[PDB]
């Protein structure tokens, strides 16, 4: 949407990490205080966190912070470390039902306090976008592009273009003008914001590679697994090993949700593993699939319902057949 | 990329590992023109879907190249796409004193099917092997020749299936074949030496929020001599004491722990004090195969750790 | 089983068994006489092709135009305007390497064009190259030596080919329903002026002799030229004499957003030179007054510009 | 501590910096300040002579410039400056520094930082985290922050968390005292080849006022073989006019027209070719020497 510019918006900034130094730095930067910029309020988290140290509880914290302040602001910017920004953006998309205001995750590759920082520009753009292009999704702003949150990954560890959306175009691109792209809408509810709990869930993340043993699937099966993510080859292939397919069939028998993804940057799983109870994850990222599992396992649903929900497009994270 | 002489008719050996072909090729005139090298196809028995490959299969192919080395001018390895990058990476370490091209290629669509990329990937690989005899294990796909141990299958559904995220291509094909100025890998001299491999239990942990110290403990049970960590960004992992202790325990037991980025591109830069070795800008495919190579040698733990961070074959960018 | 007409205009198949496979549509090839290097094409050649499609329209399910790459984007662009109410796909394609030469891309672009025309029909003049289908009047030859020879700078492709073929969510062109209309053209003198440091009023003055009905300006950025008083006056003198003067960007991508406007100059939005030139040949060939032509140039007729 | 000279010539940009990691810098605001769309070749001269005056007293040079003709200026400076021993970096912004979301501050900060810490002794163009060879650039994207491209050459340097020099082959590079070549007005035409072009266009440029003609031809340098066209081109060369054939395409290399006197410009941009012509026409060289020099790699502008 191209939102109206008639009244001065108020944006809430959840400074999660990524004391008082940010807020003072922004005070000192005139760009942030111009007439064309929305008003904003910073909530600095205590303690501030390196995003590498994040757990699902942290997603919950942030979602509760949004719900607390929802009626009081026009939009939300989540300032976050880059390392797991994509996991947080993906988690929020599932947790937040009936979301009728923009939530934009952003941050920087270089600290605001350093030289050549991208923080100023990413945060300025996020605020301006949240105020003027109020897309009702959890999104991620980086390097002049706004992405669907649950479509992103950090693709480039050293680049300012750190984030990609390998299976979906950006929602918006910033140049001389801000351009909205033809990207199709996610499913949308109606009424007041509902936060669905995401709790800790033991989920294993198996990379498929030559020489991987059945012992891996057997080892996960011992306890730390209610779900298992397979990063398989290409369009979702794995070794045809009888013991391997046995241990997977066994897993699904014990009520473990086994989800097949591609280890590739882009592409779509096309489903043998299906006969072993494995569910296809279509073109979902690991970040979307991990958080979607956390979401569903923490909800009031049985194993069959979770399995079916995993291949369904819930929030724009997957492209239906 | 050397621009090799055209003056005489080359002979290329084709290892058809998997991924009827010979009859199809007999039936395609382009493969038999005067400008094309002569070629000889060894069809493997059985043919393999590359998804079913194990390190033993890398060994088999390396022995195949060694057996036929003196007899041909170059080698094209026809291979399934799913694990092409692991095979290409494995060969780069296993072959030392490589004085002839070895080019891995295949297709996203079968030669028999409609709209196949097989004809053009194989035609180009043969032509390149004959005329641009780069002495490395390379991977040809979709008009680019890549350093093998720099590749991954990045695009599951695209004809541009392979990328080389941390190194430009060695060569690009258009109206003209253009060799790029990518710096050369380290090179030995004399007859080809195959460094063999034997099975090595290696874990691949992905770092993701909520991952516990009980994960590293789990790998430390029976099936692990090395652990690869797919860490965040420039090599970051949870810094909680339980996690860092499990890692130090692992290294105290002689497990080689190597820190990579889970990101498509970039370079890894705490964990060090816990015995974790940085894998710089290496792919999982390079790192996994490098470990298979190094662990199969009679090398002490300290030597393997050191060698992991060293550029042995062009797979990493030194400081 | 679909049947595709192939116009081989210039820019063997029996010796390749893939083309005759059961999955392929039926196709017929008409070899043109003479066969032409696309560098040699005149606007009348666009007419010959348009009329050839017209003759064959009712009897085939789609159309493939085999064409040299040098001016393929001009032909695609022209056909888009000349064909109105198009109800079947017309796909222009070719090769960077001659079919007779090694490593040729000709066979695979043709097979793809045939397959796509049959199985994923899009009722527009399109250009297929290197696994992508582009809107014809958004194209240019951007890469003289590459197999990815063509780009569509201001519009995503309409379709992409991998293991599967995927239609993209690219916004449709304004599309008329009804009987196919084929608009003939007649020769029109049009000049193309590139804006560059040290350009003189003389250039614009020269075109104002006797050989010009329209002038295309390839100006800087979003449509700027030096503010030289003599230059501006020559441009005003151009429009006074009924010459249609259209401002484009010389840049590969972007949108003109304009003075020149005071001098009678019309903004061409994000139109390529190829779309602008052919659109001018189209409009000038009709029974339209100068003011109606000037208005229509800035309107989106066939998906060639973004309003 | 390094000291960088900044020539503020004008442009969009003008319509952390003093922190301890930054080099010292001095800004000279030109009078008048110019929209780069208004630039004439004599303005290249004023800039080259400004760099000449300040050369000895600074470690690097940053040229602040409008984007519309930045690539023409960068290209010109590369020919006019010979034996360059310090970095000259041209940059600017798509959004005025006064406007919101401006790229001005970050392009300038980067250009200053790069000139000081990663010096490359070439006329370069810095934009959107990349440093390009000046005479290989074009403004490719009118509306984008990634405004500039270098279609036939990779960038020389890229900035991320770290700044890295890339393995781009160096330009031919003279050692010795800096030589600054003045230029003088030269009438040059630029002809685009397109279907339905007439011999009259070439005939008109042969009216009185042209010393050179640049052809933007198809593909690898083709044009229609119209007898009248080919004859007018030949007449132009007979009159001593330098006719150079370029590709109208964004990338690639030019490879009867030759029989008509036309010189192949290889993979040179229009910007490089035009300015190279201004340079060579301004020196005291035979038409034949000029014709030969046009196809030679003088400053890294073409691939031999
Ligand atoms: N973010 C992603 O999931 C990228 C890729 N599919 C991976 O397995 O890591
Ligand atoms: N091939 C690769 O290693 C890509 C990426 N670094 C990953 O962890 O999967
Ligand atoms: N095809 C094009 O028109 C590209 C660009 N606008 C040019 O002036 O050449
Ligand atoms: N800068 C350039 O020269 C791009 C392209 N060769 C053109 O003719 O416009
Ligand atoms: N490791 C840091 C990187 C950063 O954002 O500065 C984080 O993601 O929290
Ligand atoms: N799964 C197949 C894919 C292919 O190459 O066709 C393989 O890797 O062998
Ligand atoms: N010069 C040729 C190039 C080709 O298409 O093969 C043409 O455009 O007609
Ligand atoms: Cl990176
Ligand atoms: Cl893909
Ligand atoms: Cl090219
Ligand atoms: Cl643009």
XYZ file of C-alpha atoms in Angstrom, chain A residues 51-258:
208
model
C 21.582 -11.938 17.763
C 23.817 -15.047 17.783
C 22.747 -15.665 21.420
C 19.028 -15.614 20.578
C 16.601 -18.381 21.476
C 12.861 -18.821 20.765
C 12.120 -17.084 24.116
C 13.560 -13.929 22.595
C 11.103 -14.118 19.682
C 8.369 -14.356 22.337
C 9.767 -11.307 24.196
C 9.736 -9.214 21.025
C 6.203 -10.372 20.042
C 4.941 -9.422 23.552
C 6.620 -6.010 23.206
C 4.736 -5.444 19.913
C 1.376 -6.557 21.417
C 1.920 -4.297 24.453
C 2.370 -1.208 22.279
C 0.199 -2.138 19.300
C -2.716 0.258 19.801
C -0.380 3.096 20.661
C 1.803 3.354 17.529
C 1.338 3.315 13.737
C 4.130 0.860 12.992
C 7.030 -1.068 14.447
C 10.729 -1.211 13.609
C 12.681 -4.068 15.227
C 16.418 -3.194 15.461
C 18.228 -6.523 15.555
C 21.620 -8.115 14.956
C 22.102 -9.420 11.410
C 23.202 -12.975 12.350
C 19.673 -14.244 13.118
C 17.546 -11.409 11.844
C 15.897 -13.733 9.318
C 14.936 -16.276 12.032
C 13.314 -13.500 14.119
C 11.461 -11.989 11.174
C 10.197 -15.491 10.223
C 9.117 -16.291 13.803
C 7.141 -13.042 14.146
C 5.228 -13.650 10.901
C 3.678 -16.857 12.273
C 3.144 -15.577 15.829
C 1.352 -12.386 14.795
C -2.225 -13.073 13.574
C -4.510 -10.203 12.459
C -1.480 -7.959 11.985
C -2.845 -4.621 10.658
C 0.294 -2.459 10.994
C 3.796 -2.768 9.536
C 6.527 -4.591 11.472
C 9.941 -4.093 9.946
C 13.113 -5.819 11.056
C 16.404 -4.128 10.235
C 19.897 -3.407 11.530
C 23.398 -3.107 10.164
C 26.506 -4.925 8.984
C 28.673 -2.210 10.587
C 27.893 -0.643 14.038
C 26.454 2.885 14.032
C 29.452 3.882 16.190
C 31.880 2.794 13.459
C 33.006 4.462 10.247
C 31.174 3.534 6.971
C 28.148 2.283 8.962
C 24.974 1.213 7.054
C 22.917 1.584 10.276
C 21.838 5.212 9.752
C 20.475 4.510 6.268
C 18.790 1.147 7.076
C 17.046 2.593 10.139
C 16.095 5.854 8.443
C 14.578 3.919 5.525
C 12.785 1.463 7.809
C 11.127 4.306 9.766
C 10.180 6.148 6.581
C 8.787 2.970 4.988
C 6.875 1.930 8.087
C 5.238 5.403 8.125
C 4.450 5.683 4.407
C 4.227 2.156 2.951
C 2.448 0.320 5.806
C 2.489 -3.232 4.473
C 0.689 -5.444 7.064
C 3.381 -8.108 7.227
C 6.511 -8.797 9.143
C 9.159 -7.547 6.773
C 12.891 -7.082 6.700
C 14.533 -3.904 5.370
C 18.141 -4.017 4.202
C 20.217 -2.221 1.556
C 17.378 -0.375 -0.171
C 14.995 -3.359 -0.315
C 12.046 -4.463 1.759
C 11.594 -8.197 1.867
C 8.905 -10.571 3.090
C 10.382 -11.596 6.467
C 9.696 -15.328 6.219
C 11.221 -15.413 2.753
C 14.678 -14.059 3.802
C 18.063 -15.455 4.708
C 21.392 -13.704 5.427
C 23.089 -14.718 2.143
C 26.216 -12.529 2.193
C 28.110 -12.409 5.457
C 30.470 -9.583 4.496
C 28.309 -7.547 2.101
C 26.043 -4.598 2.807
C 23.493 -6.538 0.694
C 23.517 -9.153 3.517
C 19.954 -10.429 3.012
C 18.337 -12.255 0.127
C 14.775 -13.449 -0.632
C 15.803 -16.240 -2.993
C 12.295 -17.547 -3.773
C 10.272 -14.289 -3.815
C 10.955 -10.793 -5.233
C 11.289 -7.808 -2.827
C 8.056 -6.149 -1.716
C 9.573 -2.688 -2.315
C 12.730 -1.121 -3.710
C 14.168 2.286 -2.817
C 15.804 4.573 -5.379
C 15.215 8.235 -6.225
C 11.585 7.126 -5.768
C 10.227 4.323 -3.580
C 8.855 1.625 -5.874
C 6.287 -0.991 -4.815
C 6.572 -4.309 -6.668
C 3.752 -6.566 -7.942
C 4.378 -9.170 -5.214
C 1.171 -11.091 -4.278
C -0.307 -10.593 -0.754
C 0.021 -13.010 2.157
C -3.126 -14.462 3.831
C -4.716 -11.902 6.152
C -7.028 -12.087 9.153
C -9.220 -9.334 10.612
C -9.690 -7.633 13.966
C -7.408 -7.252 16.965
C -3.831 -8.499 16.968
C -3.483 -12.025 18.381
C -0.081 -13.263 19.511
C 0.345 -17.046 19.246
C 2.910 -18.428 21.737
C 6.183 -19.852 20.459
C 7.895 -22.016 23.021
C 11.189 -24.014 23.008
C 10.787 -27.203 20.964
C 13.550 -29.768 20.357
C 14.052 -29.601 16.584
C 16.974 -31.214 14.771
C 18.481 -29.739 11.587
C 20.041 -32.509 9.473
C 22.250 -31.643 6.529
C 22.253 -34.387 3.872
C 25.778 -35.035 2.519
C 27.668 -38.020 1.088
C 28.534 -40.558 3.780
C 25.863 -39.436 6.265
C 24.856 -42.530 8.335
C 21.551 -43.885 9.700
C 23.216 -43.219 13.108
C 22.416 -39.494 12.667
C 18.619 -40.073 12.431
C 18.877 -42.659 15.254
C 20.847 -40.212 17.459
C 18.252 -37.413 17.078
C 15.501 -39.969 17.807
C 16.766 -40.464 21.396
C 15.209 -37.233 22.807
C 15.968 -33.791 21.292
C 13.420 -34.228 18.463
C 9.736 -33.473 18.150
C 10.591 -32.449 14.599
C 13.430 -32.982 12.151
C 14.393 -30.695 9.260
C 16.160 -32.367 6.346
C 18.326 -30.106 4.164
C 18.263 -32.533 1.216
C 19.811 -32.233 -2.260
C 18.300 -30.369 -5.191
C 14.508 -30.813 -5.375
C 14.565 -32.775 -2.111
C 16.593 -35.964 -2.710
C 18.485 -38.051 -0.142
C 20.386 -41.407 -0.148
C 18.060 -44.355 -0.846
C 19.771 -46.387 1.932
C 17.248 -48.841 3.524
C 18.419 -48.150 7.120
C 18.186 -44.406 6.515
C 14.608 -44.611 5.201
C 13.824 -47.023 8.045
C 14.984 -44.602 10.770
C 12.905 -41.827 9.142
C 9.830 -44.028 8.906
C 10.469 -44.893 12.562
C 10.724 -41.202 13.428
C 7.364 -40.371 11.829
C 5.892 -43.457 13.542
C 6.916 -42.022 16.957
C 5.049 -38.817 16.036
C 8.116 -36.862 14.990
C 7.314 -34.290 12.249
C 9.890 -34.816 9.496
